[PDB]
């Protein structure tokens, strides 16, 4: 059945509550980005109103044939009334299209939604800072103080010139980066800038970019694959057979690889630095797993709360455990004790 998670009190809403069939009493239907374990569910027979960002409406219209009748986009940073109630919506900074939702209720209460995010000291003045949050419902995938990783910005910075090194060494490498959601789109960007080339990339692919209102996208991607040196690929096949059958595709113009893994975290983040990354060999094809995360690390989750003093914290992540729910509550003590709300 719907988890109470999923549920804001007072309203009848559920936020990212597709999968359950019609949700007694829910009269709107938010969803906060386009990630299947948030959609799934949806599909051109869904009869209920949906209120999410533009760019959220973009993809439901053109991926999955939702129809536009029970699409309703809303403007960021805007006060909204959806059935009765205020709502505002603010960028999450997750993937494109992403929000958190504001709920102010009749009755007082003010609730935040973070859908996923990763939280930024920018978040401090937004619309945020004007008035008490009562109750937070919070992203916390990685709510442990062993998850550090660096900037967006310092991960990039190494790709661009790893990359830029590589091609600029031997002009017949190719490089490839995978992918299996929307998201973590300044990856292949940000090299195929350094390296005066557009993406290439499968029809669905392109299809789903040309939603996403990245401004100059004409500019910078393509589904003609031979005109291109930067290839992106299903995640899947991000790895030395997958690589090697590739490279046989390219009619020998090219003689080498070098590939990108943008992966969440992983155990080598605890030890290594950014500066100090390596990566897997074998013959002409190496491969990097760089950490470009899109959740906030423990820290950057800490900051948020600490700042945004919530009078209650309901996880919405790692909830299925009884040793994982245990665990966030002694943070989310340990954390109000220390600020002192
Ligand atoms: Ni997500």
Excluded at 225 to 237: A, I, T, Y
Aim: charge should be positive.
């Amino acid at each position: 059945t719907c988890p109470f998670y999923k549920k804001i009190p007072g309203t009848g809403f559920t936020v990212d509550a597709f999968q359950y069939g019609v949700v007694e009493g829910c009269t709107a239907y938010f969803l906060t980005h386009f990630h299947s374990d948030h959609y799934a569910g949806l599909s051109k027979h869904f009869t209920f109103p949906v209120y999410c960002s533009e760019i959220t409406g973009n993809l439901l219209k053109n991926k999955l044939h939702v129809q536009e009748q029970y699409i309703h986009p809303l403007p960021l940073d805007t006060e909204c009334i959806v059935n009765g109630v205020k709502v505002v919506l603010l960028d999450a900074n997750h993937c494109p299209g992403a929000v958190m939702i504001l709920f102010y209720l009749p009755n007082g209460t003010v609730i935040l939604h973070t859908g996923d995010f990763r939280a930024d000291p920018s978040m401090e003045r937004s619309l945020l800072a004007d008035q008490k949050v009562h109750m937070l419902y919070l992203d916390t995938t990685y709510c442990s103080p062993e998850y550090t990783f660096p900037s967006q910005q310092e991960v990039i910075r190494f790709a661009i010139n790893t990359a830029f090194e590589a091609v600029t060494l031997n002009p017949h490498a190719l490089v490839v980066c995978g992918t299996y959601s929307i998201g973590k789109e300044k990856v292949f960007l940000a090299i195929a800038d350094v390296l005066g080339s557009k993406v290439g990339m499968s029809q669905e692919k392109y299809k789903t970019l040309q939603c996403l209102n990245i401004p100059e996208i004409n500019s910078l991607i393509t589904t003609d694959m031979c005109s291109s040196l930067v290839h992106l690929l299903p995640m899947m096949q991000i790895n030395f057979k997958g690589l090697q059958s590739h490279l046989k595709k390219c009619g020998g113009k090219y003689n080498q690889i070098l590939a990108f893994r943008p992966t969440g975290w992983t155990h080598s983040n605890k030890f290594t630095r950014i500066a100090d990354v390596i990566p897997q060999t074998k013959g002409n094809i190496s491969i990097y797993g760089i950490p470009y995360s899109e959740h906030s690390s423990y820290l950057e989750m800490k900051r948020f709360v600490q700042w945004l003093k919530p009078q209650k914290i309901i996880p919405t992540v790692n909830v299925g455990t009884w040793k994982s729910r245990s665990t966030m509550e002694k943070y989310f003590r340990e954390w109000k004790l220390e600020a002192g709300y």
